[PDB]
Amino acid sequence: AMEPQVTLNVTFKNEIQSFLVSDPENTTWADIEAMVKVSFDLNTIQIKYLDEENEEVSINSQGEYEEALKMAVKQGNQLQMQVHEG
């Protein structure tokens, strides 16, 4: 046990919102996507994050989300995310 609170810093265009997610192992990618959709009024989205190689990589699944979280643990419990419409 067990990943600590993670901060998701999510950019859409020139807006950014930070979401403090208390128990990331207890979350689903579907839940996170839904939060981002509701926040930015988006329907179909692609979300990317900045990985260890400092490249934007899309998260398209629960597994890709879980891997992104493993990285966040090593990087100060935060993820820098970018959202694109469509």
Helix axes 29-40, 62-74, angle to 10 degrees: 90
Given resolution (angstroms): 1.6
* Residue among 39, 4, 33, 34 nearest 20 (CA): 4
11-22 in b/e burial notation, b at 16+ Cβ within 10 A?
A: ebeeeeeeeebe
Domains and CATH numbers, the chain: 4-86 (3.10.20.90)
For residue 83, give the nearest of 18, 32, 10, 4 by alpha carbon.
Answer: 10
Q: Strands 45-50 and 78-85, how do they pair?
A: antiparallel
Tokens of 86: 């469509």
